[PDB]
Amino acid sequence: SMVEVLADHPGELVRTDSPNFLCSVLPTHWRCNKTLPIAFKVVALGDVPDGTLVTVMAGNDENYSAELRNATAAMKNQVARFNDLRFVGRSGRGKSFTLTITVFTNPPQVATYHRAIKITVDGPREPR
Amino acid sequence: PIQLWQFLLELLTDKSCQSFISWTGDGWEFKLSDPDEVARRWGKRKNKPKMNYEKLSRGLRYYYDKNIIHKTAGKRYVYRFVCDLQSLLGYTPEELHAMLDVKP
DNA sequence: GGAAGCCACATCCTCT
DNA sequence: CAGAGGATGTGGCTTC
């Protein structure tokens, strides 16, 4: 199931700490408030009825809860396609945010993507 | 390192520049009667020959959030410092006006 | 000293 | 045109 899905559309999906969900690979370091190159997606291996809401939160030791934009998406054919997700808050020098994905089924489910992305004011920048 | 609002504040406290930038007489509200001249001088002070009013005003718009300067809606070229200038200058707007013979 | 962060624009550009 | 704000790229500075 998971093996076939990872092979389905190779290289772009990564594992969450939850065996029933997978998500898009995020850049290692990105500019705060800048649009992501690849639209962030959450994929459900088990069955999640269409319409189910999905949100993401980002945070770590410096920023317990980071300001985001468009952090809400709806599941469709087992995929939650976030339309232009963005990280506004900063994660701190040499540190990365940890993403907490909440799939609003009844009961709710939560999948974690540890040390997923570093967000700074400049973002990846050419050496001076 | 000099900032746009600091620069505008200099021009506004030098009576020689009153022909192109001046206080309106209402609090800390001011007007760039000759936007191009302010732009040219701002360009010269930063060493940006291409500087014009369209780009200097973009600079002013970033101040809307930082609560430094706001726009006076409906009045062309008119803005108003909304930060605590009295505190920073040690003069109320009425005293500063008088030091500059500001005509409302 | 340099790499990595933060800031304040300078430049364009879309839209009202 | 003036004016709001979004998207990007730079030089100056401060922090590790």
Q: Using an 8 Å Cβ cutoff, are A30 and A119 in contact?
A: yes
Tell me: is residue A67 an annotated ligand-binding position: yes
Beta bridge partners of B78: B31
d(CA A4, CA A36): 26
Residue B8 burial (10 A CB sphere; 0-12, 13-18, 19+) = buried
Length of chain A: 128
Q: Using an 8 Å Cβ cutoff, are A118 and A22 in contact?
A: no
Q: Compute CA distances A60 → A8, A38, A56, B11, whole Å.
A: 32, 23, 14, 46
Q: Compute CA distances B80 → A125, B70, B87, whole Å.
A: 36, 5, 16
- By DSSP bridging, strand A29-31 and strand A109-120 are parallel
Query: Could you say which DSSP state residue A80 is in?
Result: E
Tokens of A8: 């389905």
Q: Find the discontinuities in chain B where C to next N exceeds 2.5 angstroms and give the residue preceding each.
A: none
Q: How many CB atoms lie within 10 A of CB A17?
A: 11
Residue nearest to nucleotide C8 (CA to C1'): B3
d(CA A43, CA A53): 13
Q: Using an 8 Å Cβ cutoff, are A75 and A49 in contact?
A: yes
Experimental determination technique: X-ray
d(CA A26, CA A97): 11
Residues 6 or more apart whose Cβ sits within 8 Å of residue B31? B21, B22, B24, B75, B77, B78, B79
Kindly provide the resolution of this structure in angstroms, with one decimal.
Answer: 2.5
Tokens of A112: 């974690």
3-state SS class at A119? strand
d(CA B24, CA B72): 11
A11 touches strand C (CB under 7 A): no
Report residues 64-103 of A contacting strand C, contact meaning Cβ closer than 7 Å. Answer: 90, 92-94
d(CA B7, CA B93): 18
- The alpha carbon dihedral of A24, A26, A32, A35 has a sign of negative
Tell me: is residue A121 an annotated ligand-binding position: yes
Architecture of domain B1-104: Orthogonal Bundle (1.10)
- What phi and psi values does residue B4 have, to the nearest 5 degrees? -45, -50
Q: Compute CA distances B11 → A9, A52, A60, A71, B8, whole Å.
A: 61, 58, 46, 45, 5
* B5 residue type, one letter: W
Tokens of A77: 């054919």
Tell me: is residue A88 an annotated ligand-binding position: no
Q: What are the structural domain ranges in chain B?
A: 1-104
Tokens of A82: 């976030």
Q: Using an 8 Å Cβ cutoff, are B43 and B50 in contact?
A: yes
Tell me: is residue A81 an annotated ligand-binding position: no
Show which residues sit with Cβ under 7 A of nucleic chain D. A 33-35, 93, 122, 125-126, 128; B 1, 35, 53-54, 57-58, 61, 64, 71, 73, 75-78
Sheet bearing A109-120, strands edge to edge: A13-15, A21-24, A41-44, A79-81, A72-76, A53-59, A97-103, A109-120, A29-31
Q: Is the peptide bond before B104 cis (omega within 30 degrees of 0)?
A: no
Q: Using an 8 Å Cβ cutoff, are B92 and B14 in contact?
A: no
Task: Tell me which of 2.60.34.30, 3.30.470.20, 1.20.58.760, 2.60.40.720 is the CATH number of domain A1-128.
Answer: 2.60.40.720
Q: Find the discontinuities in chain A where C to next N exceeds 2.5 angstroms and give the residue preceding each.
A: none
**Of A1, A27, A25, A4, the residue nearest A13 (C-alpha):** A25
Residues 6 or more apart whose Cβ sits within 8 Å of residue A122? A31
d(CA A54, CA A99): 12
Tokens of B18: 């009153």
Q: What are the structural domain ranges in chain A?
A: 1-128
What dihedral angle (degrees, nearest 10) is formed by the CA atoms of A27, A28, A30, A33?
Answer: 70
* Chain C bases closer than 7 angstroms to a protein Cβ: 3-13
